[model samples]
Target: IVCHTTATSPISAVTCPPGENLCYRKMWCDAFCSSRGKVVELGCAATCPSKKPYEEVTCCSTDKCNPHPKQRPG
Candidate 1:
């Protein structure tokens, strides 16, 4: 399957290697998500961790599901 490998310059795509059964996006933003988010990354993941304050972590498992911050299941 394919997923976004990074969150720079509009988008990035990469084929998921074996064992990378999930996709993740880690974004560092403010409490209201209104500040200038300086850290935004997306890539493959074996397992996703719990969320954190001011840091949004999203996980998904569909082809290109985790391509953007707006999460999608399909």
Candidate 2:
């Protein structure tokens, strides 16, 4: 599982709007923990750094180096 943490090089400013940039990493950790590497449990409904709201389609199950599409489309 890929534990979440502050991004060394975030795609967006780390200090934009709210402070959820860092939180995204933590949220990822939570998901990774719950998923436990079974059935490829992917993303979630939370955003870190307190910036962006929980985006169900944003989180991903693949490696951090890669991006995967959401299993279900809302």
Candidate 3:
């Protein structure tokens, strides 16, 4: 995915900003289903262990991407 830095935590739990729809990890996974029809593109952010200015983008999935599969795979 397009990982980048923001001003929010990936797991801080918050509402999406106005005009910006929630780009949930579920969407990505479902999109994978729609594209590959394999139901395997699963993943989600579980923690926000950023240092300072950089922030993480929180995301949620349907089922396979819950609780985050790779806790520390990164």
TM-score of each: 0.41, 0.16, 0.17
lDDT of 3 at 5: 21
- When 1 and 3 are scored with TM-score, the better candidate is 1
lDDT of 2 by residue, 1-74 (tens): 23332244344232322332222222243334565442323333234223235432333222231223347776
Question: Cα deviation of 48 in candidate 2 (Å)?
Answer: 8.8
For all candidates in order, the CA lDDT equals: 0.51, 0.31, 0.31
What does each candidate score in C-alpha RMSD?
7.2, 12.9, 13.4
Better of 1 and 2 by lDDT: 1
Best by TM-score: 1
Query: How close to the true structure is residue 46 of candidate 3, measured as C-alpha lDDT?
Result: 39
Query: If candidate 1 were superposed on the true structure by all CA atoms, what would the RMSD be?
Result: 7.2
Ranking by TM-score: 1, 3, 2
lDDT (Cα, tens digit) per residue for candidate 3, span 1-74: 22222433464344432222223333234222457532223223333122232212334322223232345557
